Structure 1
Amino acid sequence: VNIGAVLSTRKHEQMFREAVNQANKRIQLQATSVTHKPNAIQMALSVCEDLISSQVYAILVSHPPTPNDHFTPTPVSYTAGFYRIPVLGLTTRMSIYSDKSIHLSFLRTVPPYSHQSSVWFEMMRVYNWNHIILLVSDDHEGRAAQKRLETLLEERESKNKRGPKAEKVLQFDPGTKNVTALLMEARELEARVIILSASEDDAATVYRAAAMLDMTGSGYVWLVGEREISGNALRYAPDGIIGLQLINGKNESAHISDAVGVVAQAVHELLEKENITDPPRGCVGNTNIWKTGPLFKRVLMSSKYADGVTGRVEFNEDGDRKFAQYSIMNLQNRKLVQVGIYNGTHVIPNDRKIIWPGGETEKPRGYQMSTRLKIVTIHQEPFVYVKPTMSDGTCKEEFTVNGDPVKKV
C-alpha cells in the first residue's frame, strides 16, 4: 500500500520512510511523501494530483512551521473525507475538528486544548477547594471548555461537603483593551481562585490589567492552559502562577514513529479482513466511496499499539490521544519549577517549592465572605414605606404612639 503525509521536516520523509521499513516485519506498504505549500489550495490540489491518484489508503499531516495555523489541516482534512478516507492528525490541537459531524473523517494523535481543562477538575482534590470563577473567550473554544467543566461538575448523586460549585463565568472578545470592567466586577466576588483559557496576547492584556488592579497579590490562585506559559505572556504573567505542559507535544519525530506503528498495527488488522473494496477514483470518479472508511475507523478503534516514545497511546471515542500524561509546573521568578507528576488521572505527588503569588507557603482556601450584603426590597405598604428625605439629606425623625424612635434607614 501507499501512505502519504504532508509534514514540515524534509528529513521527516526519510524518518517515517525508515519507520515503514521497521514496521515491515508485521505485504507491500510503499511510502509516499509531499512537502507543504502556503495557500492550502495548492495543498489540496497536490493531494488529488499525487496521493489520491495513487489511490491506495490513508494519509497523515502535522503542523507546518506556522505556529497557530489553525486552518492548515482543514482543506486536506475534508478533501479526502469527500470519499470518507479516514485521516489522522499529528500536531494541531484546535478543538473544532473534535466535531464528527462536519468532519466524519478525522482522528488525532494528541488531545485538544479544550480537553486539557478536564485535569483541573482535580486540583482541589489535593487543595481542598470548592469555589471558582471562569474567564473564557467568546469563540467556540471557551464554550467547549465550559460544557466540559459543566459535565465534569456532574453532581455526585447522594444517598457533608458535596463537590465544587461554579460561579459567574465571564466572557470577552479578542483584542480588547478595557477588560478591566470585568475583573473589578469579579473583584467583589466571594472566592479567590481563577481559571483563564484564551489565546496568547489576550492573556498578556489580562495580566496587565490585573496587576494594575492588584488582584494578583496574596491569597490568590491561577491555573491557565498551555497557551499562556508562552513568552508573550511570560513577559506579563505574575510569579506563583501555575501552568501545565503536555509532555512530548512539540516533538514531531517521536509522534511520527508512533503514528507509523499504530497504522502498522492497523494494516496487520487489515491484511486479513473481508470484503476489501477499492481505494478512490483518482479525484475524478468523484461519486463513489472507498467503502471501507467506516470499517477503517472501526478497526482503528482498538488498535492497541501498546507503547511508543510517549508510551501507551490509546484512543477516546473521538479518535484522539486518550490517556497521555503530562507535567505540571510553576513560574518562580521567571524560572520554571517542573513537577511532572500527572500520569493520567493519577494523583500528582511531586517534591519542590510550590510558591503562591503572595510568597506564602500555605495553600489558602480561596474563601472570604462576611461582607456587606447588597439587599434589595420592593415598595409595599405595611411592610416597607418609602419616604423622601429632608433637604438636609436625612429624613425627619418621628416617634411611635408611645413615642419610641421608629428606626429608619
Structure 2
Amino acid sequence: KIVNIGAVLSTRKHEQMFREAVNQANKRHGSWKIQLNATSVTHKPNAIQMALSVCEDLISSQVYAILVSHPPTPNDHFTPTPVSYTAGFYRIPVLGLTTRMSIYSDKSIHLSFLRTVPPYSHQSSVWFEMMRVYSWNHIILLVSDDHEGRAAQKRLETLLEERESKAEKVLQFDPGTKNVTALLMEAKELEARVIILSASEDDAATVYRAAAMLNMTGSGYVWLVGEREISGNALRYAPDGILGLQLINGKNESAHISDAVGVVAQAVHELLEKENITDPPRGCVGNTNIWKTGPLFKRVLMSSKYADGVTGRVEFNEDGDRKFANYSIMNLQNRKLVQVGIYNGTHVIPNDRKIIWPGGETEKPRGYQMSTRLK
C-alpha cells in the first residue's frame, strides 16, 4: 500500500520541512509495508481557484489527511476554509495547525476536522480559575458582536455558572466599532472595575483610546483581554500593567507539522490492522459514494496520547478542541510585554516577578465600590 500525506502550505520552506518530516517518519516508524509520500500544495490566492486545484491534486492523489496552514494575511479565514470544505464530509479529516477560530468547533459544516491548538474561548475555561484565584467576586464583561466573541462569552458564562455567578453585566459590543465611549458610560455605573473583553484589535483599540480619556485605566481598575487583541494595533494606547494572556508555541508551524506527522504515523499503523480497511477514495470526481471507512477512522485518529513533539501531552478528543496547553501571561510595562506568569494548562504558576495594576498601582485591586448614593 501507498500512504500519502497531502498538505497545503505556504512558501518552499514549509513544504521542504513537511517533506523532510515525512521522510524521517518512515525511518522512525517500524512499519515496512507502508510507504510515506510527501505532497505540497501552494496557497492559491483565489477562493474559487482553490477548489479545482485541491480536487485535481489532493483528491486525485488519494492522500491520507490534509494539513491546513495559517493564511498569509494577518486575519483571514480563507486558507483553512477551502481545506475544510473540499474534503470535509468525504471521510478525510483535515488537520489545522493554527485553527484558533472559535466558530469552526460546532461540527455543523466540515464535520471531519480537528483543531491542533485550543481556541480563544478555550482559555476562558482556564480564565475562570484565574478569576477564582485572584478573588474577583464581581466582574464586568464586554463581548463584541462576533461569532468567536459569542462563543467565548458562552464558555465564560458556563464556567461562571458553576459558582452561580451572573458576571454582573455583559455589554454586547459590535465588531468594527470606533467609538464605544458612550456604551462604556453605563460601565462606570457598575461598582466593579474588572473588565473582561475578547475581541479583535480593531474593536479593542477604540475602547482603549476612549478609556484613557475617561480615566478608566487608573488604580483599582483591572482590564483583562485575550491574545487576539494582546498584540497588534490595539496596543498603541494600552494602559501599562494590563492583564493579558498569550499562548506558548504560537508560531511553531514546523513543530506543529512534525507533531501531526508523528501522530499520523501511529494512526496509519493502528488503522491498517482491522477488517474493512478500504483505501482512500480515488479521483476528484471518480468517487461516486461516501468512503466505507467513516467514523471508525476518525475515532481511531482521535484517541492517541503520548509524549511526542515539543508541546507533548496530546489528548485531542471530544469535538476536536485542544486541551492542556501552556499559557504565557505578559504584562505591558512601558509599552513592553514581559512574560511574568506561566500556566501549565491546569493551574497558574506565576513567576516571582511582581504584578502592578493598571494606572500605576502595585497593590491587588478590589472590585467593590460601596458608599454609593442610595436613594
| TM-score between the two structures when normalised by the length of structure 1 | 0.85
1:99-110 → structure 2 map (5 Å cutoff): 99-110=106-117
Distance 2:161 2:177 in 1: 33
CA contact (8 A) 1:70 1:92 kept: no
Q: Secondary structure at the match of 2:339?
A: strand
Change (3 A) 1:156 1:209: closer
C-alpha distance in 1, partners of 2:59/2:148?
32
Separation of aligned partners in 1, 2:141 and 2:317: 26
Residues 306, 314 of structure 2: 8 Å contact kept: yes
Give the whole-Å Cα distance in 1 for the aligned partners of 2:185 and 2:308.
Answer: 49
Native 8 Å contact 1:337 1:352 kept in 2: no
Q: Offset at 1:286?
A: 4.8
Is 2:23 aligned against 1:21?
yes
- The C-alpha deviation readout for 1:196-253, integer Å capped at 9, x for no partner, is 1111121111111111111111101111001122131111211110111110111211
Q: Which has the larger Rg?
A: 1
Count of aligned positions? 367
Give the Cα separation in 2 of the matches to 1:56 and 1:142: 35
Does the Cα contact within 8 Å between 1:93 and 1:112 map onto a contact in 2?
yes
Displacement after TM superposition at 1:285 (Å) = 3.3
CA distance in 1, matches of 2:311, 2:272: 27
**Which aligned pairs between 1:29-40 and structure 2 lie closer than 5 A?**
29-40=36-47
1:295 matched residue in structure 2: 296
User: How far did residue 51 of structure 1 move?
Assistant: 1.5
Separation in structure 2 between the aligned mates of residue 95 and residue 354 of structure 1, nearest angstrom = 30
Give the distance between the partners of 1:154 and 1:306, measured in 2 at CA. 34
Distance 1:98 1:117 in 2: 15
**Conserved 8 A contact 1:5-1:32:** yes
SS in 1 for 2:338: strand
Is 169-178 or 45-54 further displaced after alignment?
169-178
Give the superposition deviation at 1:294.
1.4
Q: Is contact 1:199–1:228 with CA below 8 Å preserved after alignment?
A: yes
Structure in which a larger fraction of residues adopt strand: 2
| Structure 1 match to 2:282 | 281
CA contact under 8 A between 1:245 and 1:327: conserved in structure 2?
yes
Q: Deviations over 1:119-170 (max 9, x none)?
A: 2101233311111111111121222112111211233599xxxxxx411111
Contact 1:4 1:59 in 2 (8 A): yes
d(CA) in 2 for partners of 1:275, 1:305: 27
Q: What is the CA-CA distance between 1:25 and the residue it aligns to?
A: 3.5
The residue that corresponds to 2:71 in the other structure is 64
- 3-state SS of 1:98 partner: coil
Asked whether the 8 Å contact 1:84–1:104 carries over to 2, the reply is no
- C-alpha distance in 1 between matches for 2:141 and 2:44: 39
Q: Distance in 2 between matches of 1:118 and 1:365?
A: 23
Separation of aligned partners in 1, 2:265 and 2:235: 41
* Larger CA deviation: 173-182 vs 35-44: 173-182
Structure 1 contact 184–213 (Cα < 8 Å) conserved: no
1:196-275 matches, within 5 Å, as 196-275=197-276
CA distance in 1 between counterparts of 2:179 and 2:328 reads 34
Name structure 1 gaps, 5 residues minimum: 159-164, 374-409
Q: What is the CA distance between 1:316 and its match in structure 2?
A: 3.4
Cα offsets for 1:62-121 (capped at 9, x unmatched): 112111112321122121124231111111311121111222111121111222222210
CA offset at residue 177 of structure 1? Answer: 3.0
- The 5-angstrom pairing of residues 80-159 of structure 1 reads 80-156=87-163
Greater Cα offset, 267-276 or 173-182: 173-182
Quick one: percent identity of the two aligned structures? 98
- Could you tell me which runs of 5 or more consecutive residues in structure 2 were left unpaired when the two chains were aligned: 29-33
Distance, in Å, in 1 between the alignment partners of 2:194 and 2:27 is 53
Task: Note the C-alpha offset of 1:272.
Answer: 1.2
Q: Compared with structure 1, are the counterparts of its residues 231 and 81 closer, same or farther at alpha carbon in structure 2 (3 Å cutoff)?
A: closer
